[PDB]
Design a protein around this ligand. Structure first.
Ligand SMILES: [Ca+2]
Ligand SMILES: [Mg+2]
Ligand SMILES: [Mg+2]
Ligand SMILES: [Mg+2]
Ligand code: NA
Ligand code: NA
Length: 252
């Protein structure tokens, strides 16, 4: 029978990730926080890893609220990577994830991209360069050599998202990415399909498209990073936050 799990104790912490006990700008406590107190660079990356492994002969359902930095895509973090990998968080710190052009081989998952990188071909396809808070969502996979590619549903037009805005109101019925908002990542074993929802948008990819094994065991990691884009010294805190304590994960 499946198990549904909630609590920080179910996750190991790797890299530049900590707990912000008493946020001043969000109605929350004990948020998991990435990229804090370190400038952009190769080691500015973090992951939480669910302590038990999952496999794609059974359903999987993960829900977590995330709040993006209210920082432009040339100053803030790279985004969020909800990643399946046969390797652990230290492998992610060494070899990268799913937020750039290359990361750890044969991983895959859902990318909420909030940071522009001049050498990322997908950022060019998605028209990420520009003013405001320009980003995108999509499933991606890393091939056996680590190269990242878009897989599954979407076009540049439909993948696009404004990952934050300059407003504060909580009354307009709209998505505001700097607030806490649910990300749902679901795997339906019956139709071998992954679904991701965020910001009122949906993405779909098959198991085949993600390239993952139908039976091998996988780790699940929630990742962020702020690896840097050049040497100008232009950056902000890159602080990305998730309510890991309030997340739910259903698996078998
Ligand atoms: Ca990007
Ligand atoms: Mg608002
Ligand atoms: Mg958000
Ligand atoms: Mg399939
Ligand atoms: Na407002
Ligand atoms: Na930072």
């Amino acid at each position: 029978p499946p198990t549904t799990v909630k609590g920080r104790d179910n996750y190991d912490f790797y890299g530049r990730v900590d707990i912000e006990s008493n946020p001043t700008d969000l109605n929350a406590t004990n948020l998991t926080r990435y990229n804090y107190g370190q400038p952009p660079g190769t080691t500015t990356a973090g992951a939480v890893q669910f302590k038990n492994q999952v496999s794609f002969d059974k359903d999987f359902d993960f829900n977590i609220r995330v709040a993006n930095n209210r920082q432009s895509n040339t100053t803030g973090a790279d985004g969020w990577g909800f990643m399946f990998s046969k390797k652990d968080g230290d492998d992610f710190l060494k070899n990268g994830g799913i937020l750039r052009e290359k990361g750890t081989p044969s991983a895959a998952g859902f990318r909420i991209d909030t940071g522009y990188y001049n050498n990322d071909p997908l950022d060019k396809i998605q028209k990420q360069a520009g003013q405001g808070y320009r980003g995108y969502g999509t499933f991606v996979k890393n091939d056996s050599q680590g190269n990242t590619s878009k897989v599954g549903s979407g076009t540049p037009s439909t993948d696009f998202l404004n990952y934050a805005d300059n407003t504060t109101n909580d009354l307009d019925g709209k998505f505001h990415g700097q607030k806490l908002n649910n990300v749902n990542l679901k795997y339906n074993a019956s139709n071998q399909t992954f679904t991701a929802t965020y910001a009122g948008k949906t993405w779909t990819a098959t198991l085949s498209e993600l390239g993952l094994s139908p039976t091998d065991s996988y780790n699940f990691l929630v990742t962020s990073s702020q690896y840097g884009n050049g040497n100008s010294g232009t950056y902000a805190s890159g602080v990305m936050r998730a309510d890991l304590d309030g997340a739910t994960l259903t698996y078998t």
